[PDB]
């Protein structure tokens, strides 16, 4: 073999701050979730 | 059938012929080759074959077959439909796929590396290329024209370049003659260039040419040609830097120190 | 049937085609020997085409062009095996070829590790696999084909002895066109016709005395692959339909 | 007894057979000085299979199909994904053979660095494995299996001094094919009967005098490989049991 700094290929990945929050969202229980979701509802005035 | 025309600039009676030979093969879809030395005026010709073809409708991408990545060769050549950024709708482009219905220009074919040479091969006549991933390969209708200044036969003897690829590619090879051999369009080439040149350096008007000027410019074997004439004239002209008295002095090489 | 796109009348290509028919029935692998550019590919179809092998998905892969790891991987790489990396792994050409005639080209110019594996596959209908131990057993009919002297390579150890020495039952010759001398004319004509119907000419006006002289004196390294490029090249040099051709070109690197 | 293939009637063959029996029980490296085509790993199979434990795998396959650095990759493989070209851990070749024994084809072929790796490892039995880690040791009997005068290679310093003496604990030089005399006929017969059994022939018709003379003349480069291909290929071209075999196919690649 040999040591070098070449390039590979073929993959797929993408992420963003807001999407992240959307993903962690399903990892926690409804009861503990509804809490997180109530908190959103004070901040947002057009969401009931 | 429309003709681009551009700058034929040939009064050789052999450039005429050169134009005549390429014109017959312009309609043809077969692999072709173009051969030139250090100063040959070949880039225009590759365009003059495709400019003159029915598929003049097609796109005319021309890759630089010497600079590609060894590693990305597979991707660069083919390309991978999955693209990038996950479920992204944007599809990958490709090399041979982005030239369907249009001529493809390959340059520095002799210099093209062994990995590239083996990779060409198998895609030249098969017509099927498959992007990394998937089980489906799609035929492309792509016209191969190759421009090279190096001598292919010598490369074959060495074994540096595969013999089979050269043999398969281009039934007919256009022949370009050196400038020292035109010998005739210099009065014309030389003025044309100089005329451009006057506006690039912002003069009004050419002074004219001394007889001596033309004794020197005829008399020389002009190593790496054409382009050479431009340089001999373009410099010499800006050099002189005026429009009272005519041009009197031309320097062949700006190496010599004095 | 699927042989007129070949032709010949010199008893040489006659005895070649005679041979094909007898051995067509036999499913087991055969060895095809012939010069570069002389019927290896054209011939290949005929073996598959004979009713015994007509039904299947025929795949032909050349080995002289392929790389070390790439060559081994293409025939059978990660078909069932799962490993980190190697995304979208596939069975490869050999697996796809099964149930249909196969021809892997240039057997002599192959990696030595790969050659040993190929011989194993040929023997007793067994194919190795990186994943599951279970070996596939499909009677794909693929015959090894080479152009140069395989036996010479074995003496220096360039070619695995077992792989050749086992399938050195069914060798078949493809003589050069150097030797043929009769097929030239008739082929000349055929190709000629094809390049003028290609450029839209009235009629093929034939050859000259001189044309034939040079045709038959010429050594013709390349055969149909060769000749044909030349035949058409000479076609295109003329482009009118009045008098027969008298200028021809075997080397376009010439000047005049 | 594995059908006891290739029995040698000649005393030289028998003597070597007797010598092999003493060798198998103990853990001593053994070197074979036979010519290619002769003594081809036949006995290698005997020496892994006559040993105290037949349980250990007999991977073998050390033909020098690899020119240089690949051999190292073929051998001690690679570490736990370290360096270029590595995705997982590769135990390689001795770790695979473990418990069992190893065989080397043209040990003479491998580069001095590979030699040097063979000598250090064998005494201790610990193997570096290329990538490197904590030294690891396993017990494997080595067999080695070369073709030219080896002392030549240390006389012209191409074979390591300590490695060569340590490795040829004990030579088992072997018989040439030409040296066998009347065993030709027995070979011929064995192979002929095996062949008619393989091709589902009713019986064997016999030999002739002409074919007998042809075998009596021949120089015969391969102890097993040269003559066996000849006899089965003779039998294949014949394909009949009514008339005795009279034609020999001496070279499968001869013209026409
Ligand atoms: N017939 C011509 N008409 C106009 N310009 C030309 C002609 N021949 C050569 N030239 C000039 O000389 C140069 C030729 O360079 P190019 O053909 O790219 O060299 P090469 O073919 O060796 O790569 C061009 O930039 C062009 O301006
Ligand atoms: N009688 C024929 N009719 C049509 N095409 C032919 C005929 N003979 C040869 N050819 C073409 O000429 C080409 C010659 O290829 P060849 O150089 O023999 O390949 P290889 O070197 O792999 O055997 C073939 O691809 C085939 O299509």
Strand content of chain B: 5-15%
Question: What is the number of helical segments of chain B per DSSP (H or I, 4+ residues)?
Answer: 10
What level of helicity do the residues of chain A show?
40-55%
Task: Give the H and E element order of chain A.
Answer: HH
- Whole-angstrom Rg of chain B: 22 Å
| Secondary-structure content class of chain A | mainly alpha
| Shape assignment of chain A | elongated
Overview of the structural elements:
This is part of a larger assembly, with 1 copy of chain A (48 residues) and 3 copies of chain B. Chain A is built from 2 helices and no strands. By secondary structure, chain A is mainly α. Chain B is α/β, with parallel strands linked by helices. Chain B folds into 2 domains: 1-179, no CATH class; 180-258, no CATH class. Chain B is 33% helix and 9% strand. In chain B, the strands form 2 sheets. Chain B has a 5-stranded parallel sheet, with helices on one face. Chain B has a two-stranded antiparallel ribbon with strand order 4-5. In chain B, β2 (62-63), α3 and β3 (104-107) form a beta-alpha-beta unit. The longest helix of chain B has 15 residues, at 186-200. The radius of gyration of chain B is 22 Å and the shape is elongated. The structure holds adenosine-5'-diphosphate (ADP) (2 copies). Residues 7, 9-10, 36, 40-44, 149, 226-227, 230 of chain B line the site of one adenosine-5'-diphosphate. Chain A: This is RNA polymerase sigma-54 factor. Chain A: Sigma factors are initiation factors that promote the attachment of RNA polymerase to specific initiation sites and are then released. Chain A: Belongs to the sigma-54 factor family.
């Amino acid at each position: 073999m040999k040591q070098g700094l070449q390039l590979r290929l073929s993959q797929q990945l993408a992420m963003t701050p807001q999407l992240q929050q959307a993903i962690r969202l399903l990892q926690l229980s409804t009861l503990e979730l509804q809490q997180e979701l109530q908190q959103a509802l004070e901040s947002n005035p057009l969401l009931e | 059938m429309a003709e681009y025309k551009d700058n034929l600039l040939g009064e050789a009676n052999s450039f005429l012929e050169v134009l005549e030979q390429v014109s017959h093969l312009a309609p043809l879809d077969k692999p072709v080759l173009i051969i030139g030395e250090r100063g040959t005026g070949k880039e225009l010709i590759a365009s003059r074959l495709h400019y003159l073809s029915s598929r003049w409708q097609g796109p005319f991408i021309s890759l630089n077959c010497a600079a590609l990545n060894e590693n990305l060769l597979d991707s660069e050549l083919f390309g991978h439909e999955a693209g990038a950024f996950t479920g992204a709708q944007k599809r990958h482009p490709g090399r041979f796929e982005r030239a369907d219905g249009g001529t493809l220009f390959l340059d520095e074919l002799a210099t093209a590396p062994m990995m590239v040479q083996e990779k060409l091969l198998r895609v030249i006549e098969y017509g099927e290329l498959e992007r990394v991933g998937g089980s489906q390969p799609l035929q492309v209708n792509v016209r191969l024209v190759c421009a090279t200044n190096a001598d292919l036969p010598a490369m074959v003897n060495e074994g540096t370049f595969r013999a089979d690829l050269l043999d398969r590619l281009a039934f007919d090879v256009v022949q370009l003659p050196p400038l020292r051999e035109r010998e005739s369009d210099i009065m014309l080439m030389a003025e044309y260039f100089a005329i451009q040149m006057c506006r690039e350096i912002k003069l009004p008007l050419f002074p004219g040419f001394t007889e001596r000027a033309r004794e020197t410019l005829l008399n020389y074997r002009w190593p790496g040609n054409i382009r050479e004439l431009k340089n001999v004239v373009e410099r010499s002209v800006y050099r002189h830097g005026t429009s009272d008295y005519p041009l009197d002095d031309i320097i062949i090489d700006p190496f010599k120190r004095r």
